[PDB]
Design a protein around this nucleic acid. Structure first.
Lengths: 75, 95, 97, 83, 109, 95, 109, 97, 83
DNA sequence: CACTGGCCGCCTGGAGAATCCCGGTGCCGAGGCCGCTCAATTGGTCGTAGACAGCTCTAGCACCGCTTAAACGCACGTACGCGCTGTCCCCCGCGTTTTAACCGCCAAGGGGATTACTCCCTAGTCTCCAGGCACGTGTCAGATATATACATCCTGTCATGTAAGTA
DNA sequence: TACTTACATGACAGGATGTATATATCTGACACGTGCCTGGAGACTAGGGAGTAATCCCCTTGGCGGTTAAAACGCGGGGGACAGCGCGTACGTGCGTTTAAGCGGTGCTAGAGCTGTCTACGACCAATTGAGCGGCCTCGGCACCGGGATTCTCCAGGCGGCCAGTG
């Protein structure tokens, strides 16, 4: 079971916090290093990214939707 | 009656009856077999004629056609066709 | 609700049918009209054997069928399934035409 | 007597079924007019020579044998009509 | 006291005509002179090619539960042998259609 | 002691001088010209032969080669070759 | 007692040899008979083709400002003419290289 | 800091050079050795005219040139610039090899 | 007198030069060994043909005529070698 | 942070439909028979094509010594494929209406094909003669070498937009 | 929320080097004079292939009525292409080293190639035939029609993860 992957996405983006936003591939590899079967959960990560952008807690750097780069909010 | 139009009909029919006793042939398939024997005859004869010209030879013999088989026919088709060519020519020389 | 197939499924059945089928795919008399139109551009009021029109139609179907073999290969080459004019032009150029 | 437009005589479903024999699963919309032109060009190449065969033989009737010869000279040999 | 007219195909044990192929070499105008074993060899090659392709045609006909060779059987016999395919890459069979082959990308998952 | 080997040297030389009085030729370009004229001669001769066989004609006339060059030479080269060959047979018959 | 020999190359006014083309046609074994106008027509076509390609070769060499034509000039002449490229589509010129043809995407910017 | 070109312009200078120049691109001796190695497998104890070796050299270079033009067309067809094994496979298969 | 690994004699920069003459910007690393194989198969074809020409000719030396003639049959016509 | 109920992605059973498979039935092309003829056969003759033997000579193979050009390997780098997803739009599928393709039926005649006549031309042969190729030589066009000059490609610098830090 | 500032990025100039440009040199590759003998050629002739006149018939063209299968067009909708964007690698490019290609020189020889011999070999001519072809005819394999299973495909409902709600 464990926690849902929203905390996983927040941890993945907060692990590095470099100048540009983190891409989908880098965050998926981050969750793979943390430990998760991302092979059967691609639409899961897509819905998590879209949901977390829509609440405004995540701001998307350059890309559109679940593509591109994602960076942390102002506060 | 008209002018006779030569074909390979009964010949291919004999070959089919030798290889398949119960299997028949259609007329369009027989036209395609006429096209086949004419095309392969044309390819072998044309390349072997060029081989005759290249060595400045006035004769096309079994050696030139054999070499033409090695050029045109691929692989095991080539060497098997060589085998039946040799058996045919040895039977003919032995009458 | 009336029954309804998904796209490509009928196309795939049409595929397996037309390699399963052997008959002509071009309408006979419109092809005859086309070959007469092309012929009168070179010599007017030409006459045709029906076997000649059928041989031209078979050869045209053969040319186009082989051309779409190459076109399908070029389309899957570009990671696509729908062919495009640049696929046809590519196949025609690589073939040497 | 004169014929102006038989390029549309090779209809779009005919091209569709040709490509279905060709193994094409999906056809773009711009394919059909181009293949009509391509077939027209191929028929230019074939029929010009087939005509040249006919007035080479001083004939008015286009024969299937001339078509067979014209195809096989292009290396697109057709079986089933020779003889 | 002329001898019995025996046939050169039966002399060589063949079915294809030695005499007609020899005459067509003489009349296809391919050399001034033609060796005697050349038509026998050429008829042997033709008879063997037709023998294999008719064998595959009859086998394909028996596969499709038909007792008669149709040109579809001929096209299936050409295209299912890769060496015969390489022999006849540029040749189209009348009314043979095309060999059933679908690329794996086209097929659904 | 040597044996004569035939080439198309002098004819290509006179033609290149006639179309360009000042321009020379290398030896390898001469070999390629020999190969070119041999290839074109063999193409036209073979197609003329096939036209001769297909209508059961045992003769090759300028009509046959005119048909052949209409078959092989594409577009504008065909009508120009027709023009020069017609003029050539015109001076040949008039002299 | 005999007329002076005057060549059919001079009769047609073509520098290509009518006699030699006729000899190669007879010994190239293409028909039983050859009409007399056929080598004249063939030699005229041959001379026209050679004159046109040598004209392009001389023009290309003058474009490279070189007074002798080389196989590179022959490649430049052949590939730049659409009818010659149609005639010599599958033909390779030795040591002539290729026509400079860089695809448009390969150029920077 | 010592000079260094960006990737690609040395390639195009090579393009302009060996398209502008004509000379042979395979080292002659290893090509001759490869030809002798292949011909040894077919009929034993073969020797080669030197002109025959350069003839195979010109023909092989031009054959590879034609293939690499076809793979160039295939690569730009697939929105790429770097050619791949499937490009040569496509070129050979469309041409019919 | 034994020849064992001469396909590696066609070096990688030699393949790079060939692709430069063909007009190639970038060549993958997987390309070199299979172009060695493709060229290997091509020489198998043309040298097999030339060997048949040779043993038909009852000579022991492969000549340029046999080369250009084998290329000529396969639709790969070569100029400049006495054809 | 654990428990938990509703909501969306996925599993599963079942219904309809296209095809496969089983019959019957009538039919028209495949096979078989008969007359014919023409093309294969045979034997002698005659000319000749190439196999064979032998000699000569020449280029291909081997060996060797320098002599660098390039093959090669490594390292820094950047750019190219490319995997993934979001977005737009384009073509298959199906239903209905339209319409000309097919059939089939009949008239007519255009020329394809065949036969006959007759002659235009073309290949063969003895004789003759002259043009193009081997051979030799001489000689300037171009490769090479060296010295200038710009193109251009990368890099350094200035200006500016813009995101970030901040009161 | 505006003020300020430093960093990414486009605009502009400049150096270095690779390529473009100018001039000497020498050399061997192109080009020209000679011998010649072989290949072209002119006259005549035997004889045949093809050009041309006539016909017929049959096979192509033209035309009319009916069916409906094929096409055409619109709605709908899903899937296919594709734009973009980081990522991660995978060659590109530069640089020093190995070495093997390349060049120049020498020797052997084995095979290419030319020339006399002649003998197997194949084409050619008169006569004869028997196997292959044109035509007819029959019939049953197969084309077409009709009915039941099966596989396939798509959707309805039903389950699991999961996401939101709660304690």
């Amino acid at each position: 079971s464990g926690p849902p992957v929203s905390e996983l996405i927040t941890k993945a983006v907060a692990a590095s916090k470099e100048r540009s936003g983190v891409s989908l591939a880098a965050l998926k590899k981050a969750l793979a290093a943390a430990g998760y079967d991302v092979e059967k959960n691609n639409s899961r990560i897509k819905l998590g990214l879209k949901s977390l952008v829509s609440k405004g807690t995540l701001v998307q750097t350059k890309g559109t939707g679940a593509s591109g780069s994602f960076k942390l909010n102002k506060k | 009656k008209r002018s006779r139009k030569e074909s390979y009909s009964v010949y291919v029919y004999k070959v089919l009856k030798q290889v398949h006793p119960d299997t028949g042939i259609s007329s369009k398939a027989m036209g395609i077999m006429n096209s086949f024997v004419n095309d392969i005859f044309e390819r072998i004869a044309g390349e072997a004629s060029r081989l005759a010209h290249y060595n400045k030879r006035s004769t096309i013999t079994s050696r030139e056609i054999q070499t033409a088989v090695r050029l045109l026919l691929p692989g095991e088709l080539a060497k098997h066709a060589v085998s039946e060519g040799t058996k045919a020519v040895t039977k003919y020389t032995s009458a | 609700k009336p029954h309804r197939y998904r796209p490509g499924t009928v196309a795939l059945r049409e595929i397996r049918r037309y390699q399963k089928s052997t008959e002509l795919l071009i309408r006979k008399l419109p092809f005859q009209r086309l070959v007469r139109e092309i012929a009168q551009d070179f010599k007017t009021d030409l006459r045709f054997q029906s076997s000649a029109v059928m041989a031209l139609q078979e050869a045209s179907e053969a040319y186009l069928v082989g051309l779409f073999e190459d076109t399908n290969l070029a389309a899957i080459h570009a990671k696509r399934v729908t062919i495009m004019p640049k696929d046809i032009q590519l196949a025609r150029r690589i073939r040497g035409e | 007597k004169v014929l102006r437009d038989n390029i549309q005589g090779i209809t779009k479903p005919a091209i569709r079924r040709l490509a279905r024999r060709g193994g094409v699963k999906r056809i773009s919309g711009l394919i059909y007019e181009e293949t009509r032109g391509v077939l027209k060009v191929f028929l230019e190449n074939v029929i010009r020579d087939a005509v040249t065969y006919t007035e080479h033989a001083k004939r008015k009737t286009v024969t299937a044998m001339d078509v067979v010869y014209a195809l096989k000279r292009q290396g697109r040999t057709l079986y089933g009509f020779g003889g | 006291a002329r001898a019995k007219a025996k046939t050169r195909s039966s002399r060589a044990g063949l079915q294809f005509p030695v005499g007609r192929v020899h005459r067509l070499l003489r009349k296809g105008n391919y050399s001034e002179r033609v060796g005697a074993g050349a038509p026998v060899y050429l008829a042997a090659v033709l008879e063997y090619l037709t023998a294999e392709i008719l064998e595959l045609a009859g086998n394909a006909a028996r596969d499709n539960k038909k007792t008669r060779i149709i040109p579809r059987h001929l096209q299936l016999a050409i295209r299912n042998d890769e060496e015969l395919n390489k022999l006849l890459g540029r040749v189209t069979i009348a009314q043979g259609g095309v060999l059933p082959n679908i690329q794996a990308v086209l097929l659904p998952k």
